[PDB]
Amino acid sequence: GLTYSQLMTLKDAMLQLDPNAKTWMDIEGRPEDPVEIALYQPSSGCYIHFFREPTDLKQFKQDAKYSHGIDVTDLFATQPGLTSAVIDALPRNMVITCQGSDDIRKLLESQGRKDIKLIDIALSKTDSRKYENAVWDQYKDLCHMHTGVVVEKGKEEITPHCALMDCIMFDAAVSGGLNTSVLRAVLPRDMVFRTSTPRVVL
């Protein structure tokens, strides 16, 4: 769980979202056990992005091989309870656009956010991954957490799925290109991860 000071820091951070602007949301991992969560407002450029340690390591390993390619050891330092804290702090009656709403539905509903409405924009495999190369080429420095080799079931190597890149590239398909806004993280780096570097005299 988050400290009281962090919860107040989160609330002030969540204020940067426009409750009536177009907001994308995508997750990696199943809604009952998500490991990467991203929200994206292309108008203001704000984006929410954080990670979570998985509960089902067996399901995580299969999800890593065929989807996100995340090393589980990179998730040991994630802030616990951050998923519930961020979902609790989302603006009320917000409308969220997503590709595949039924799992975004399960996640938000498990946290009691029935006020949030979902727009299930569905796209082809061609349209959803249309700007995949352009988005990764432009924003690869926003997520270095996809270190494993991902294959698609014969098996051949594909580009790993990132919840943040998915939001950007799905919006790129609908809007027909990359948005000109400069992307800015809403969540502080020290709220997403807990520092593993001990204070040492040198």
- Residue with structure tokens 């938000």? 108
Token pair for residue 18? Answer: 């426009």
Nearer to Zn ion, 90 or 143 (CB): 143
What minimum distance in Å lies between the beta carbon of 84 and Zn ion?
A: 20
Contact range with Zn ion by CB under 5 A, out of 55-63, 78-86, 112-120, 138-146: 138-146
Q: Was 161 annotated as part of a binding site?
A: no
How many CA atoms are closer than 13 Å to the CA of 52, on its beta-carbon side?
25
- Residue with smaller CB distance to Zn ion, 98 or 145: 145
Per CB under 5 A, 143 contacts Zn ion: yes
Query: Residue type for 46, please?
Result: C
CB of 70 to Zn ion, least distance (A): 8
For 56, other C-beta atoms within 10 Å of its C-beta total 13
82 lies in the binding site for Zn ion (CB under 5 A): no
Nearer to Zn ion, 91 or 138 (CB): 138
- Could you write out the DSSP letters of every residue in 47-109? EEEEE---S-HHHHHHHHHHT----GGGGTTBPTTHHHHHHHTSPTT-EEEESSHHHHHHHHH
Question: Is 66 or 91 the residue whose CB approaches Zn ion more closely?
Answer: 66
Gaps after residue numbers in the chain (C–N over 2.5 angstroms) = 153
166 is in an annotated binding site: yes
Distance (Å, rounded) from C-alpha 90 to C-alpha 13?
A: 10
Nearer to Zn ion (CB atom), residue 31 or residue 91 = 31
Q: Does 162 bind Zn ion (CB under 5 A)?
A: yes
Annotate 70-92 with b (16+ C-beta within 10 A) or e (fewer): beeebbeebbeebbebbbebbee
- Please state the closest distance from residue 156 (CB atom) to Zn ion, in A: 21
Find out whether 26 is annotated in a ligand binding site: yes
Indicate the annotated binding residues for Mn(2+): 26, 28, 166
Interface with Zn ion (CB under 5 A): 143, 145, 162
Indicate the annotated binding residues for Zn(2+): 36, 143, 146, 162
